C-alpha cells in the first residue's frame, strides 16, 4: 500500500545529499557531560603540554604559545619588562583537546601572561602622492611606535 505522497525512485525524486538524522537531545546532553568531564580530568591530572591560544589584542587576533613574541603597532603605556595578563582569549588548545569560547573564554578558565620587553619605533614609511601633468607631488615620512611583547605562559584551570 503506497502512502499518499510516495514518489518512485528516480534520479531527482529525492535530494542528492544523503539523509542525516541528528541524535536525540537527552542522550546528547549526557554524552556532552561525559566528554566535558573527561576533558576536565585530563586538565586536572595534567595530560597536556605546550598549550596554544588565540588571543584578541590590539584589534587583531594572535595565535600565541608560550615563550613567544608579538609586535603591537602602538605604544601600550607600560614600562619595559612589565608583566601583564592577556584576557580576551578566543581559543585555548593543546594536543588531544581544544576549548572554544563563545566568543570569549572564561577568565577563571584560561590566563595568558605576557611581558613588555621592548618599546621601539618602526622603520620609516614613505607616503608619496603623485598626479601627473598637474604638478602634484607630495612626500611624507612616518614612524609608527611599536611594542614587543613576549608571551610567557598559558595556563588553564579545571572549570568545565
Partner 1 sequence: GLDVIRIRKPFHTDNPSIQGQWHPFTNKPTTFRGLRPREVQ
Partner 2 sequence: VLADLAIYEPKTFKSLAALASRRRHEGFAAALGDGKEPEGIFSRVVQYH
Partner 3 sequence: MTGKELFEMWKIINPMGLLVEELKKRNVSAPESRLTRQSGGTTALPLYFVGLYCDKKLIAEGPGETVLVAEEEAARVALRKLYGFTENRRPWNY
Partner RNA sequence: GUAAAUUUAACUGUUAGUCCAAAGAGGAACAGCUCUUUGGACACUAGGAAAAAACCUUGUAGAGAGAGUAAAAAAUUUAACA
Q: Which does 127 bind (CB under 5 to 8 A by kind): partner 2, partner 1, RNA, none?
A: RNA
> According to the binding rule CB under 8 A, does residue 70 interact with partner 1?
yes
Binding segment toward partner 1, per CB under 8 A, in 13-21, 23-31, 63-71, 133-141: 63-71
From the number of C-beta atoms within 10 Å of its C-beta (0-12, 13-18, 19+), residue 48 rates as middle
* Residue entry with cell 592577556: 86
Which one, 51 or 105, has the nearer CB to partner 1?
Answer: 51
> According to the binding rule CB under 8 A, does residue 87 interact with partner 1?
no
> According to the binding rule CB under 8 A, does residue 110 interact with partner 2?
no
> According to the binding rule CB under 7 A, does residue 122 interact with RNA?
yes
Which one, 50 or 125, has the nearer CB to RNA?
Answer: 125
**What is the spatial distance between Cα 138 and Cα 134, in angstroms, rounded to a whole number?**
12
Residue 42 beta carbon to RNA: minimum distance, rounded to whole angstroms: 31
| Rounded alpha-carbon distances, angstroms, from residue 103 to 54, 84, 90 | 11, 22, 6
> How many CB atoms are closer than 10 A to CB 28?
11
Amino acid at each position: 500500500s503506497y502512502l499518499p505522497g510516495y514518489v518512485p525512485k528516480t534520479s531527482l525524486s529525492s535530494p542528492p545529499w544523503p539523509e542525516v538524522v541528528l541524535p536525540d537531545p537527552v542522550e546528547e546532553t549526557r554524552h556532552h557531560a561525559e566528554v566535558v568531564k573527561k576533558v576536565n580530568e585530563m586538565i586536572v591530572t595534567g595530560q597536556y603540554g605546550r598549550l596554544f591560544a588565540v588571543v584578541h589584542f590590539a584589534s587583531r587576533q594572535w595565535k600565541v604559545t608560550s615563550e613567544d613574541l608579538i609586535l603591537i603597532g602602538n605604544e601600550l603605556d607600560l614600562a619595559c619588562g612589565e608583566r601583564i595578563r592577556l584576557e580576551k582569549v578566543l581559543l585555548v588548545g593543546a594536543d588531544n583537546f581544544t576549548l572554544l569560547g563563545k566568543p570569549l573564554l572564561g577568565k577563571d578558565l584560561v590566563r595568558v601572561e605576557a611581558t613588555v620587553i621592548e618599546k621601539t619605533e618602526s622603520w620609516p614609511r614613505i607616503i608619496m602622492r603623485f598626479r601627473k601633468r598637474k604638478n602634484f607631488k607630495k612626500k611624507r615620512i612616518v614612524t609608527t611606535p611599536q611594542t614587543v611583547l613576549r608571551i610567557n605562559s598559558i595556563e588553564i584551570a579545571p572549570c568545565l
